[PDB]
Write a protein that holds these residues in place. Structure first.
Motif, PDB file in Angstrom:
ATOM      1  N   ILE B  78      11.711  58.548  39.598  1.00 40.13           N
ATOM      2  CA  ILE B  78      10.459  58.826  39.293  1.00 40.13           C
ATOM      3  C   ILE B  78      10.013  60.229  40.056  1.00 40.13           C
ATOM      4  O   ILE B  78       9.911  60.177  41.117  1.00 40.13           O
ATOM      5  CB  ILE B  78       9.229  57.926  39.711  1.00 40.13           C
ATOM      6  CG1 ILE B  78       9.859  56.436  39.644  1.00 40.13           C
ATOM      7  CG2 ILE B  78       7.993  58.084  39.248  1.00 40.13           C
ATOM      8  CD1 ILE B  78      10.589  56.229  38.197  1.00 40.13           C
ATOM      9  N   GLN B  79       9.588  61.287  39.304  1.00 40.52           N
ATOM     10  CA  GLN B  79       9.084  62.120  39.832  1.00 40.52           C
ATOM     11  C   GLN B  79       7.574  62.120  39.356  1.00 40.52           C
ATOM     12  O   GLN B  79       7.105  61.728  38.632  1.00 40.52           O
ATOM     13  CB  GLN B  79       9.536  63.647  39.161  1.00 40.52           C
ATOM     14  CG  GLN B  79      10.811  63.666  38.658  1.00 40.52           C
ATOM     15  CD  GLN B  79      11.329  65.053  38.306  1.00 40.52           C
ATOM     16  OE1 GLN B  79      11.939  65.550  39.335  1.00 40.52           O
ATOM     17  NE2 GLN B  79      11.349  65.427  37.018  1.00 40.52           N
ATOM     18  N   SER B  80       6.826  62.953  40.317  1.00 46.13           N
ATOM     19  CA  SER B  80       5.327  63.287  40.196  1.00 46.13           C
ATOM     20  C   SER B  80       4.493  61.993  39.917  1.00 46.13           C
ATOM     21  O   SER B  80       3.710  61.458  39.218  1.00 46.13           O
ATOM     22  CB  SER B  80       5.327  64.216  38.756  1.00 46.13           C
ATOM     23  OG  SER B  80       4.053  64.379  38.497  1.00 46.13           O
ATOM     24  N   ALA B  81       4.921  60.991  40.957  1.00 50.81           N
ATOM     25  CA  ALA B  81       4.410  59.837  41.036  1.00 50.81           C
ATOM     26  C   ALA B  81       2.745  59.713  40.602  1.00 50.81           C
ATOM     27  O   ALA B  81       1.960  60.720  40.973  1.00 50.81           O
ATOM     28  CB  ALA B  81       4.418  59.237  42.248  1.00 50.81           C
ATOM     29  N   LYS B  82       2.291  58.798  39.819  1.00 51.40           N
ATOM     30  CA  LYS B  82       0.811  58.456  39.657  1.00 51.40           C
ATOM     31  C   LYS B  82       0.738  57.179  40.161  1.00 51.40           C
ATOM     32  O   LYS B  82       1.505  56.168  40.279  1.00 51.40           O
ATOM     33  CB  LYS B  82       0.597  58.490  38.336  1.00 51.40           C
ATOM     34  CG  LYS B  82       0.672  59.803  37.676  1.00 51.40           C
ATOM     35  CD  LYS B  82       0.531  59.575  36.160  1.00 51.40           C
ATOM     36  CE  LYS B  82       0.421  60.860  35.307  1.00 51.40           C
ATOM     37  NZ  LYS B  82      -0.329  60.763  33.863  1.00 51.40           N
ATOM     38  N   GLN B  83      -0.670  56.891  40.855  1.00 50.41           N
ATOM     39  CA  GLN B  83      -0.926  55.421  41.022  1.00 50.41           C
ATOM     40  C   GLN B  83      -0.826  54.551  40.089  1.00 50.41           C
ATOM     41  O   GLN B  83      -0.439  53.385  40.105  1.00 50.41           O
ATOM     42  CB  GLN B  83      -2.524  55.480  41.397  1.00 50.41           C
ATOM     43  CG  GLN B  83      -3.172  56.105  42.611  1.00 50.41           C
ATOM     44  CD  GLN B  83      -4.621  56.385  42.278  1.00 50.41           C
ATOM     45  OE1 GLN B  83      -5.286  55.177  42.156  1.00 50.41           O
ATOM     46  NE2 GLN B  83      -5.091  57.382  42.690  1.00 50.41           N
ATOM     47  N   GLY B  84      -0.535  55.142  38.791  1.00 49.17           N
ATOM     48  CA  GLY B  84      -0.243  54.164  37.685  1.00 49.17           C
ATOM     49  C   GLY B  84       1.274  53.721  37.792  1.00 49.17           C
ATOM     50  O   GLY B  84       1.515  52.768  37.240  1.00 49.17           O
TER      51      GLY B  84
END
Lengths: 238, 238
Positions: B78-84
């Motif tokens: 995963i790049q650019s993680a979101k809280q999502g």
């Protein structure tokens, strides 16, 4: 697990007393206590049926007593410990004489000249070589523990917070660096890919069985109680 | 144990990337990655046969990649993680479509707004009452952990240096005392006679999955790395 004994380890100074406590298979008739010195065989201390000593003359001296007042739990007491009492005390249980005996894990006892000498280990983790990783596609970590006394340590390996057994190799015996100083080491082998992930966490844990709260510490130094000493490292992106 | 995944836990700040790593049954053909949000069901991210993505359109967006370059180990990034992205990532393996699936333990991922908020627990052990001991002939210890963040803790009980499971009862979920603060507790029940032996040692251990060495700590405070926090007590002669 079957026969259960408490504690697992005990360190006393000459002249003190310890009571070992055993708890036979929830259903069991005969109960034996044995003394097994380090490099020697097991000597029967005493055995009970239900709540009565069957054979008593076994007890090597009057420093020893055993009771099983309600016929279940038993307690073997030593007063006036001698270094000579240093040994593993084994509980066992059985249905009737000669019908395959069932053995506890034991209680390890060390009696020392002075509790001031009891001291926890200093623990060090050594990282794998680049050459292993590339040539063997495996990575071997080295754990070193030393400076402890007495010989009451258990070493384990933890990877991401979960214990591991496969891939481990631990020296069987601590090494006597000196009078009041032991040493011990262990290897954990993991895969190259696993070591190379920097979200991977590796920990060597040494459990040290030392003084109890009830032991009085003549102080100055930090009291060498039972305690866990660990060394850890994170995987490295190559 | 079967399917194995690394790491077991990970905490990232929004915008970072994590690679999850999975290793199917030593002999296996199909490999699935799933995303399972806390209170929701598993969504298939992608599956491979040998070394080829079979179905790709599954990937929910372009922040996700998965590779299995030699057909064994797989890595989902995963790049650019979101809280999502906060969720448990599950690996599974299978022989052929529809032939009973075999599931990993998962990798738990939490993505936060700021790593500065990550903080280990403070751990407290509460002793049994005299009334329980005498009336029930049992003794119940209480372990309390609080002030931690995020929710990445595992609690265990140790008696004389050996882990115990029977007699334990741990809250299933940590409790949200606040925005960046959890709380959790557990009970260990043992026998009266056992608690009454002052050579008996009891320890509650909380394993906290925190920052890795590779995470940069903007400092001041002690860096909240993965660490074990314990509280202990010795049996008391009544």
């Amino acid at each position: 697990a079957g026969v259960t004994q408490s504690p697992r380890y005990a360190v006393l100074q000459e002249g003190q007393s310890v009571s070992f406590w055993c708890d036979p298979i929830s259903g069991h008739d005969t109960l034996y206590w044995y003394q097994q010195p380090r490099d020697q065989g097991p000597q029967l201390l005493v055995y009970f049926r239900d709540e009565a000593v069957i054979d008593n003359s076994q007890l090597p001296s009057d420093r020893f007593s055993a009771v099983r007042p309600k016929g279940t739990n038993s307690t073997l007491k030593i007063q006036s410990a001698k270094q000579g009492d240093t040994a593993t005390y084994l509980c066992a249980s059985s249905s009737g004489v000669g019908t395959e005996v069932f053995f506890g894990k034991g209680t390890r006892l060390t009696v020392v000249e002075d509790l001031r000498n009891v001291t926890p280990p200093k623990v060090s983790l050594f990282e794998p070589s680049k050459a292993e990783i590339a040539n063997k596609q495996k990575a071997t970590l080295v754990c070193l523990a030393r400076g402890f006394f007495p010989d009451h340590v258990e070493l384990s390996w933890w990877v991401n917070g979960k214990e591991v057994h496969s891939g481990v190799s631990t020296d069987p015996q601590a090494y006597k660096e000196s009078n009041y100083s032991y040493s011990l080491s262990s290897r954990l082998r993991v895969s190259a890919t696993f070591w190379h992930n920097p979200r991977n966490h590796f920990r060597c844990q040494v459990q040290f069985h030392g003084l109890s709260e009830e032991d009085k510490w003549p102080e100055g130094s930090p009291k060498p109680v039972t305690q866990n000493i660990s060394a850890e490292a994170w995987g490295r992106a190559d």
